Design a protein around this nucleic acid. Structure first.
Ligand code: ADP
Length: 964
RNA sequence: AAAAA
């Protein structure tokens, strides 16, 4: 249940600004200031019968911590919650000041001789927070996969995975913990890692209190109700849209000299400015940077979609120079101080050598490809303001204390792996946050380079959209299940029942039932149409529609259609059946060869790509974006609707998108698409539609294409049998048919909707993912990881202790003894298959000593995949076997034999940064494979694993962090 | 494509 709900207005005045324009962006005030206001919303979830006092009435007598500045309403409220011992979820933008709240919780815990845990999503963030907190409190420690420092500290900074582990082991630390702070909780919605947060939260004692720090989310109250329900305690939410440094949003149409303000500091969308920007749409990054360095709006960050891009843009800037030699002095000292902390052999590395020149010119690069030490030294140089321009990958925005005055996006679209799509509102929100250093800059500038006549409503949805929901991403894992079986007080079902996924599911039932009710009435508001005899007329037409589709499926099959798609052939295009491009003309076709992915499978209809000329293309469609032989048209590419101009274009399609084939062929220029050739085909297209006003002649499947299979003719006669049966109904000739059909069809639609919804609420009655739990239990029982009564076996106990790699395969390898006759260097090379994920250029064939153990483990892998398949788990057996990459087996092998980093870097195309990260994961995996051999009494194995650790842990691989 | 324990 909810209570104490209030919204509170806040208001300030800011220095007026013209930004990059010529007039004042906002109508100024008498004082010469600009007034901006923001909202602070509060609400609390209460357990049954709880004795609660309104939070605004609370007066804090003793402050556990004081601050130089005056607190914002959202901060004062959140701190009042903590002072009272009540959990709180703080939802605000990155710059707002959520650390102030977390700090107070820490101060309070330390004064009360209690312990407190601070969790973060990323190692990098952990280190930065440890460094920041240590300075302010002193009694601080750090727990991470890499480093452990002062574990007995009052305040522990650790990663969420590390906390998850502690809980399952039931450590004596939690017994003394009063508060647990979750920084960036919204990561709980991560498709792959999100479950870690949920799992961790559920496992916490009801005695502990929480501070959840999150970006602005629309469903914060849901999260709080869930906490309240599973931990039987109050949980507040403090939400605000407050933005410390006001933002200005600009569009930069490519290849132009214009720069347009489209969204001002009041989040007002400038309709006319946007119209001007789109009208001016028909090097640039260089122009823009120069303009920023000139107007003195640096430091600036330029986000690219790939590492490769960040480096190329960097080289195009080494012409410019932003630093005074007095700055180049302090800069280099910092750089060399850090570099000197590396082993002597590594201070000469190429990446280190080639990057310093840029740094001195004041140009930075930042992405996962860099050496860990280069990443942190560049982050530090940015803080001190020695770097005026930083070409960064999308991650930087996540990093704390790395804000910039100006932020530049090089494109309005992004490649998410599946589609080349528009940035979403949610994305863009988190994207705007990186601009504006709280104390230093009046305003923050955001610039987005655009190269397409985007529609207004699409632009609004992106530049002025809503924040994304915090939805559960819960799923089951074997390690998780085994641990829940093992631990005494709880079970796997317990986890399911307490998930936020299950919670959200339960909360939607009333929502769905309300909708059904609306539907039923709407369905009876039609009551009955005139005549039930229209039902027959509807069914007969439905069957015909279906049979006619089957006919189309045959006609368009390559075995029939291809012989009739000569250049110039008239075809009716309908891609996905939702985009009628009307009648186009075949340019050519070709069989589809997937070079990047061999084992990819094409349907017969997908197997051929047909190039087609259409003249119904929407005039503002991004035609420069569709690639050759790629049938997946980007969004924004659509047919023109009523009242829109059209153009000519060649688009790639499959045989599925051919609605019908015409009995005509117009002239197709052999001269490709060249300066006005296809526009003449559009002419011929226009003329043909005039020659045949009634309609375009369709090839007769039987009399022209000669399709006469016994089965196809049986089909073509089922249609006629109906086509007559229909034209003998009193309704075909009757009047008001187009009205009695519409009335009935709508009812039919309501009916279907109600049915499908009825299933939804039915399926939603049971606890979530029980079916999957059952199947995974089979796999575990079958492999002997536990008894049919779900009591954990030795295999299972081992598997629980394995977290850095596939727990099932690794446990099997260990028990089948696949490591017994392997030298340490061999063991390392094999395990790299469990520590490596990214794919790359196929590595040279493996020699016997490495290729053998590989094959012996792929056998065990297949044996497990088959079992996973038998259990009816959605898994591609072969793909699972390949899940474990071996592209670095020879790299790890040699490195364990003394080879230099510079030497192994020449064995692969994998970035230095990626190499180190995987070596560190391998160490982690090995450290786990040592704690295991302890709990198995395999002296032979423990020693071999300990030997692997020494071979790996050396040189640049074992180098420490700059911070700590 | 980019992040990531
Ligand atoms: N009420 C306030 N008035 C002025 N400055 C503040 C206030 N609250 C926080 N700050 C400052 O703003 C900066 C950003 O705060 P911080 O909490 O680090 O960001 P986050 O919201 O990501 O935790 C900090 O350096 C902090 O000192």
């Amino acid at each position: 249940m909810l209570a104490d709900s209030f919204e509170q207005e806040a208001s300030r005045e800011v220095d007026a600004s013209k930004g990059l324009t010529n007039s004042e962006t906002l109508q100024v005030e008498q004082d010469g200031k600009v007034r901006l206001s923001h909202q602070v919303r509060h609400q609390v979830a209460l357990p049954p019968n709880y004795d609660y006092t309104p939070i605004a009435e609370h007066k804090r007598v003793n402050e556990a911590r004081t601050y130089p500045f005056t607190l914002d309403p959202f901060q004062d409220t959140a701190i009042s919650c903590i002072d009272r011992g009540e959990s709180v979820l703080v939802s605000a933008h990155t710059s707002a000041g959520k650390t102030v709240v977390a700090e107070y919780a820490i101060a309070q815990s330390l004064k009360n001789k209690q312990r407190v845990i601070y969790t973060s999503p990323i190692k990098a963030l952990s280190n930065q927070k440890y460094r920041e907190l240590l300075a302010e409190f002193g009694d601080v420690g750090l727990m991470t996969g890499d480093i452990t420092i002062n574990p007995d500290a009052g305040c522990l900074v650790m990663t969420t995975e590390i906390l998850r582990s502690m809980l399952y082991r039931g450590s004596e630390v939690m017994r003394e913990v009063a508060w647990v702070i979750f920084d960036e909780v919204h990561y709980m919605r991560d498709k792959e890692r999100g479950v870690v947060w949920e799992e961790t939260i559920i496992l916490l004692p009801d005695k502990v209190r929480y501070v959840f720090l999150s970006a602005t989310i629309p469903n914060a109250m849901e999260f709080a109700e869930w906490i309240c329900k599973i931990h039987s305690q109050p949980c507040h939410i403090v939400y605000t849209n407050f933005r410390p440094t006001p933002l200005q949003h600009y569009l930069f149409p490519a290849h132009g000299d214009g720069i347009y303000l489209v969204v001002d500091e009041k989040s007002t969308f400038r309709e006319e400015n946007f119209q001007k920007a789109m009208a001016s749409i028909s090097g640039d990054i260089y122009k823009i940077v120069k303009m920023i360095w000139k107007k003195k709006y640096n430091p600036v960050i330029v986000f690219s979609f790939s590492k490769r891009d960040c480096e190329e843009l960097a080289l195009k800037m080494s012409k410019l120079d932003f630093n005074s030699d007095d700055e180049k002095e302090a800069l280099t000292k910092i750089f060399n101080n850090a570099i000197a902390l590396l082993p002597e052999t590594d201070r000469e590395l190429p990446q280190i050598k080639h990057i310093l020149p840029l740094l001195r010119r004041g140009i930075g690069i930042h992405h996962s490809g860099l050496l860990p030490i280069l990443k942190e030294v560049i982050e530090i140089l940015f803080q001190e303001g020695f770097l005026k321009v930083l070409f960064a990958t999308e991650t930087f925005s996540i990093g704390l204390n790395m804000p910039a005055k100006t932020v530049v996006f090089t494109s309005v679209r992004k490649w998410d792996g599946q589609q080349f799509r528009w940035v979403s509102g949610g994305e863009y929100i988190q994207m705007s946050g990186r601009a504006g250093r709280r104390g230093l800059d009046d305003r923050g500038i955001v610039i987005m380079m655009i190269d397409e006549k985007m529609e207004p409503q699409v632009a609004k949805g992106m530049v002025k959209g809503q924040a994304d929901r915090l939805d559960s991403a819960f799923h089951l894992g074997y390690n998780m299940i085994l641990n829940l079986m093992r631990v005494e007080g709880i079970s796997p079902e317990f986890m399911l029942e307490h998930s936020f996924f299950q919670f959200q599911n339960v909360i939607s039932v009333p929502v769905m039932e309300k909708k059904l009710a609306e539907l039923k009435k709407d369905f009876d508001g039609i009551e009955v149409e005139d005549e039930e005899n229209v039902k027959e007329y509807h069914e007969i037409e439905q069957a015909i529609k279906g049979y006619r589709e089957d006919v189309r499926q045959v006609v368009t099959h390559p075995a029939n259609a291809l012989s009739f798609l000569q250049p110039g052939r008239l075809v009716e295009i309908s891609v996905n059946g939702k985009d009628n491009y009307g009648w186009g003309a075949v340019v050519d076709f070709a069989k589809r060869i997937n070079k990047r992915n061999p084992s990819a499978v094409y349907t017969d209809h997908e197997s051929y790509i047909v190039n087609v000329v259409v003249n119904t293309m929407y005039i503002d469609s991004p035609v420069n974006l569709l690639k050759p032989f790629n049938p997946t048209l980007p969004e924004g590419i659509r047919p023109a609707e009523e009242g829109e101009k059209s153009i000519c274009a060649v688009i790639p399609i499959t045989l599925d998108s051919i609605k019908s084939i015409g009995n005509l062929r117009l002239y197709m220029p052999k001269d490709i698409r060249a300066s006005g050739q296809k526009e003449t085909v559009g002419k011929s297209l226009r003329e043909v539609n005039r020659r045949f006003p009634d309609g375009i002649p369709v090839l007769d499947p039987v009399k022209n294409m000669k399709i006469e299979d016994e089965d196809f003719l049986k089909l073509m006669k089922k249609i006629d049998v109906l086509n007559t049966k229909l034209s003998s109904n009193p309704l075909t000739n009757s009047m008001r048919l187009e009205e009695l059909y519409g009335k009935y069809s709508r009812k039919h639609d309501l009916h279907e909707d109600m049915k499908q919804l009825k299933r939804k609420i039915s399926e939603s009655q049971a606890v979530i993912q029980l079916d999957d739990l059952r199947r995974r239990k089979r796999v575990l029982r079958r492999l002997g990881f536990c008894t049919p009564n779900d009591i954990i076996e030795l295999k299972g106990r081992v598997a629980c202790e394995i977290s850095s790699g596939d727990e099932l395969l690794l446990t099997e390898l260990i028990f089948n003894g696949n490591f017994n006759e392997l030298k340490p260097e061999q063991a390392a090379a094999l395990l790299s298959c469990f520590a490596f994920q990214e794919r790359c250029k196929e590595a040279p064939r493996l020699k016997p000593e490495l290729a053998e153990p590989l094959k012996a483990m792929r056998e065990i892998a297949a044996k497990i995949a088959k079992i996973m398949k038998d259990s009816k788990i959605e898994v591609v057996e072969k793909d699972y076997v390949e899940s474990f990459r071996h592209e670095l087996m020879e790299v790890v092998y040699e490195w364990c034999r003394g080879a230099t980093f510079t030497q192994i870097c020449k064995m692969t195309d994998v970035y230095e940064g990626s190499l180190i990260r995987m070596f560190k994961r391998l160490e982690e995996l090995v450290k786990e494979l040592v704690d295991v051999a302890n709990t198995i009494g395999n002296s032979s194995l423990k020693e071999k694993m300990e030997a692997v650790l020494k071979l790996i842990h050396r040189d640049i691989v074992s180098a420490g962090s700059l911070y700590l």
